Paper text:
[name] ([name]) is a pentameric protein of 115 kDa composed of five identical non-covalently associated pentraxin domains. The B-face binds to a range of ligands, with the canonical example being phosphocholine (PCh) head groups in lipids such as phosphatidylcholine. This is a calcium-dependent interaction, with each [name] monomer chelating two adjacent Ca2+ ions.
Maps corresponding to pentameric [name] were solved with both C1 (no symmetry applied) and C5 symmetry. In all cases, applying C5 symmetry yielded maps of better resolution, corresponding to 3.2 – 3.3 Å. The increase in resolution upon map symmetrisation and high degree of similarity in the resulting maps and models strongly suggests that solution-phase [name] pentamers adopt C5 symmetry, which is reinforced by the low deviation in the angles between subunits in the C1-symmetrised pentameric models. Within the structures obtained by cryoEM, five intersubunit ionic bonds contribute to monomer-monomer interactions within the pentamer. These bonds form an ionic zipper from the A-face to the B-face of [name]. One of the salt bridges, Lys123–Glu197, is present at pH 7.5 but absent at pH 5.
Residue numbers in the entry:
A (entry chain C), B (entry chain B), C (entry chain A), D (entry chain E), E (entry chain D): 1 to 206
The structure:
Amino acid sequence: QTDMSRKAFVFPKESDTSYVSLKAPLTKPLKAFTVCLHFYTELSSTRGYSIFSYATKRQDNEILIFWSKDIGYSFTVGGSEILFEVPEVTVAPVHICTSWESASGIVEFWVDGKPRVRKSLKKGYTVGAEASIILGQEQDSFGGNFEGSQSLVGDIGNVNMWDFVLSPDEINTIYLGGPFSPNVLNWRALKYEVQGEVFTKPQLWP
Amino acid sequence: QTDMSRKAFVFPKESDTSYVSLKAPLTKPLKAFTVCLHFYTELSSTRGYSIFSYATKRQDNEILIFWSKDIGYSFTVGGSEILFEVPEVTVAPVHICTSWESASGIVEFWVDGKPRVRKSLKKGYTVGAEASIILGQEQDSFGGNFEGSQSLVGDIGNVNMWDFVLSPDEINTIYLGGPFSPNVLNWRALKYEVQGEVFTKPQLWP
Amino acid sequence: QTDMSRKAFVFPKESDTSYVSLKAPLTKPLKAFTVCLHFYTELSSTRGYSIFSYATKRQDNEILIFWSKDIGYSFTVGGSEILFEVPEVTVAPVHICTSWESASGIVEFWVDGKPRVRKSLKKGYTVGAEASIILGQEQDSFGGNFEGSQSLVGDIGNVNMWDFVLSPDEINTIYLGGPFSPNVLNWRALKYEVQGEVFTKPQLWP
Amino acid sequence: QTDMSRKAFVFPKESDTSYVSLKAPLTKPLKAFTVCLHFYTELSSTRGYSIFSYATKRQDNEILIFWSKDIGYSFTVGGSEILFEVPEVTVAPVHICTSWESASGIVEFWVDGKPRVRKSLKKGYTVGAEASIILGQEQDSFGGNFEGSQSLVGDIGNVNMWDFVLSPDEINTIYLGGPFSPNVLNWRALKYEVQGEVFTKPQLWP
Amino acid sequence: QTDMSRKAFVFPKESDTSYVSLKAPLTKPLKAFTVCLHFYTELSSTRGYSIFSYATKRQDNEILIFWSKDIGYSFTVGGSEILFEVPEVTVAPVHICTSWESASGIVEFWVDGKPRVRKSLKKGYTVGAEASIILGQEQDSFGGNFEGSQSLVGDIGNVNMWDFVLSPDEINTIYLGGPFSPNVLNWRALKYEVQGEVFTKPQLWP
Ligand SMILES: [Ca+2]
Ligand SMILES: [Ca+2]
Ligand SMILES: [Ca+2]
Ligand SMILES: [Ca+2]
Ligand SMILES: [Ca+2]
Ligand SMILES: [Ca+2]
Ligand SMILES: [Ca+2]
Ligand SMILES: [Ca+2]
Ligand SMILES: [Ca+2]
Ligand SMILES: [Ca+2]
């Protein structure tokens, strides 16, 4: 397990082979989660890209956080989708926290510490635990079948995952980088594998 | 009596059956009131919605606080209406306080602690006490006949009602959430009934 | 004499009969003056309106402070006009101080503590003492012949008048509401008569 | 010698006769200078105007600081011109400092404490001591031949002149109005001659 | 060695012959570098210009930092180019730091302390040390063959070079002008030769 603190993964070249795979010590299926990650790319005005792809043997978009050009953030669970329209994107690092609860279907999406309105998605579903988690690519099979036009170019870091919906107060401490304990996927205790042109570098964001 | 402090009602999906009814322990008719409530929705650019709807068996728009698409806030009492035109809408939680006095007919409308110009509506009228208060819908009968195109999608909370016009200073302490005592409808002592797809969740706003 | 501190006159409907008349104990004619007042209205994009009208039996526009739509402020003394162009105007309460000196004819106009450039008007003129001062209407005869399209809708207060040009430092004190001593017309010691639909209410501005 | 501190010259009418002449106790020609001044006018969007005219028997534009409509500031020495483009202009008092060095021909222009890029003008030239310094007008003969379309309307003050290029640090203390010692033309100790409609008034800028 | 602290080179005319050449003690070739500098010019809207130009007898664009009109910054190493698009640009001094590493090919570009996204360029290349470094011009032969349409006009200073990629934290102390030790090219210990119309003056930026 590596402390990746103060570091980011860098995807400096457009490739369909470059990705990192994150491994979860996960067993019980997720009835709810929060995923938070900090990323930086200039593609936002150019094309869509996959921020965070979680896949299962049955479902290649089991969780996907996707920037879709001109639309904004696409958040999709169990192959279903909602949009959080973004009117004008800015060339700066962006922190996102997004969380989903099966009991209510409530999705929260938080961008740079400000909440988007809660939306309903896929009420009562369960996210499978037998998961392939990938950064840098969108996977259309379990751990594979990437597309070059969907790769992330730029940096991703602070990828942390919880099996419960963080409260707004908790999410604020994440955004301020207070101390917190991710119990599904922990940037301070990460397990990962690297393929292709990918690098570990000091994080550009504070 | 429930303390709803730091909690909001969430209407996550458009429907004509999800609503909350609020119960007022009210005997005398109102010669004046202040309604304050804090709400959050992204519908504003898209369609109209009922923020707060007070009805009586003789009048289905006895008090209505309504967002009119492209217009702004519509405030109407006793079936008559005035507009507080809003030039451009931010996508953020908004706190409104509206107050009406029969003796003068003066309407005060306050948005995020800044006053709109005072306007005249229904001088000498009186609002009935035997009333249905509903959040999330506009009611065209004494407690029913909603319309899906008028349902609120998003969050509402801190709904407080007084049987008198708050001074500007008092309204400022509401907006800052200083201590205050609502004597018609109190968020810290609320009595309510939930119907349909409505959830109680931590408030997104501070 | 009434302390009107913290209070404003409210003109909540368009009418040609709602006005207040202010009484000045003047005897000696004015060679110079400053008038300061704080007002709030939403008419500014809609139509022109009289802010402050001082009339004498020979001259209905002996002093007029007038908002001319798309123009901005019209300041007129002795029936003669100068324009302080305002290109776009915020929907907020506005403090104005305007000072005129016969000896030089210099007009200073101050809006929310910022000076406009000094302009010349009616060098050597003198404003008569035996005067009718009216708020909310434009006098086309000595104390009468109002026009509905020229009435103020909204609030006016802190109306203070001096028979001398305040220095810029003094005017900055007025803008901050420090202690000051108006020696022609004093909000803290006002003499007035109310006519028609007009109300006295807590001031909305700080 | 008069202390003009906290005072400005006011040119309230457009005219070709109102000007003030400033007397320099100047006995050695200038190989370099700094001139700094505060002025305030609304002409900027309307027409060109003479901010500071320094003339000699040999040349009527020995130094000229001139606002030229839609262009911005024209700075000219020895009859030759450079422009400092100002794309959009604000209705506020403006402080300028401008300093020229013969040895390098470097012109520094500073507006409200921010430097414009250094530019070259009249390297090796020598500005004459036999000087007519005029405020409010552009003099096209030695102390005369004004043009009404070129007069300043508004205020000018704190005119200070040095026979050397101030460092950026010194310029910053002028902009903040720290204590300083002008050794050519001193507002603390000015010698001046007023002609026509010009007034001395308290300064409007801080 | 000269301490050039608080000082800048000034290029006040467009010319072919105005340049300065900088010398390095360097002998071992650069597998990586950081170059940081302050420059100030008004050309950005008008034409392209060379900010920093490092050449070797094999390659006249061995490192080039170039402003290309409407593009923004062009960063080129070994004759190969990448763009950091700048959407809109304004007349202020600008601090840039640019760092390249052969092992990864990662380019960092920092403008006024904010990072641009890391990009890939000329992975595994090696930059020769037997080098001509020139400010003010772009050299298309080893120390020669400039073009007037590519000269810098305005100021350049604080030119510091390291043979390693500064961390983000180190680059932040450069931007704040903390103490630091450039081990290739040091503004506090500079060796240089001046040709043509060039001057040394107090820096305009803080
Ligand atoms: Ca997929
Ligand atoms: Ca795909
Ligand atoms: Ca109704
Ligand atoms: Ca309805
Ligand atoms: Ca009149
Ligand atoms: Ca009239
Ligand atoms: Ca001339
Ligand atoms: Ca002329
Ligand atoms: Ca070249
Ligand atoms: Ca070239």
